[PDB]
Symmetry: D2
Subunit: 116 residues, 4 copies
Amino acid sequence: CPLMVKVLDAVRGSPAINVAVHVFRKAADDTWEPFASGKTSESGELHGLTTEEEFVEGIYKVEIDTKSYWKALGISPMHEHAEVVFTANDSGPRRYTIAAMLSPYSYETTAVVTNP
Amino acid sequence: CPLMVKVLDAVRGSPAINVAVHVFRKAADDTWEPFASGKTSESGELHGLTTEEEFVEGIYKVEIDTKSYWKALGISPMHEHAEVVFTANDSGPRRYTIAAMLSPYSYETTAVVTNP
Amino acid sequence: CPLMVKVLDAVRGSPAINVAVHVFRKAADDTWEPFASGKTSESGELHGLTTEEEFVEGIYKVEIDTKSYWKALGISPMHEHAEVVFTANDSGPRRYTIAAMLSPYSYETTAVVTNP
Amino acid sequence: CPLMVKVLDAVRGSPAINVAVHVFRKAADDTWEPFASGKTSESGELHGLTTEEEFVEGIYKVEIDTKSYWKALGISPMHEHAEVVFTANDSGPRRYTIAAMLSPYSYETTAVVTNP
């Protein structure tokens, strides 16, 4: 798993289950090329987005669609969405975990990088 | 001041001085219309972005260009930039403060809303 | 103002008004000596805690009593309180702002340091 | 594992390896009774702190000793330590994950609660 996404609901203190996550890769011609997508599991984690073969060097955008998750919980949020736009494998491949804590008014993201 | 932006350097624990900030307003035809821009002052704050007359209801994007600020401090960051995309004045006008704590690998944003 | 405290309610996205704040200074004999205290104002800020004469070098604890603030809003929180324990004026006097974002389950603090 | 602790180094974007963690349980006579302790592993996680039999209802303090971890990395930090003081099993037993993102000047904690 070269890329994992984990989402927490910071208001309720619990994993954010079934949040949509889309990943894009910046193309040669400056456009956002769709790369992979999925939904967080009951642990708040999304595995299997990509492979070590597919996950090349690049600029990657991770869009987490928070708006609809709050609606299932009866909330209208402030942020439309959350984004993490980071450069990947710039110096050889890494394992990346994009971590997101959400709220109706705040959000942290962190890119946690390790090696295999 | 219906809209203020404040940026902190969470690594050094100090205001983030002279960071570029661009604000856009989602247009009728789904495009990001440029709205206002500026640079943070020595307190890390950016005032005078807009007026109560200009700052209508809408979906607004605040782009904080972190990448170049780290370069002036000798750092290559992970995130290309930071964004806050929020809906404004949805229920009458408010005062908004978008607050940003930055790092080479993490970032919080919060939308702090009050009335006049 | 060598020491300022600012508290935000990260759940509601607004200043945290009338939160109790106690500051202690580590004494010579390892004990927490009471130093100053107050309540946040309508901006979420607490000014006038101390003076440049009184605010000597030391280890200082800032206790923010979150539990009772949530009760006034009908909430039972997870954290009993929030604390920031930091060393001050270690290399000459500074201005310190202790910043706190709260929630029933999460909390950031940051020590933001500047000079006069 | 009714109680797990995970620590991230938010400055370097990586797990915080071999951080000391002490847990205390508030005793009947208002004192902090030592409960369990350990060191984070290479993933930044600390497992096996306690058992479902030992981890009763109570007020628990988790002390993460950040100061010495920065020293191994050549840093003098601002915060002496990080603490999370939370009430546990108040309404039946839960699984708790205390999550910590650290820095020389900032720190988040979150209590992430789930059921088995």
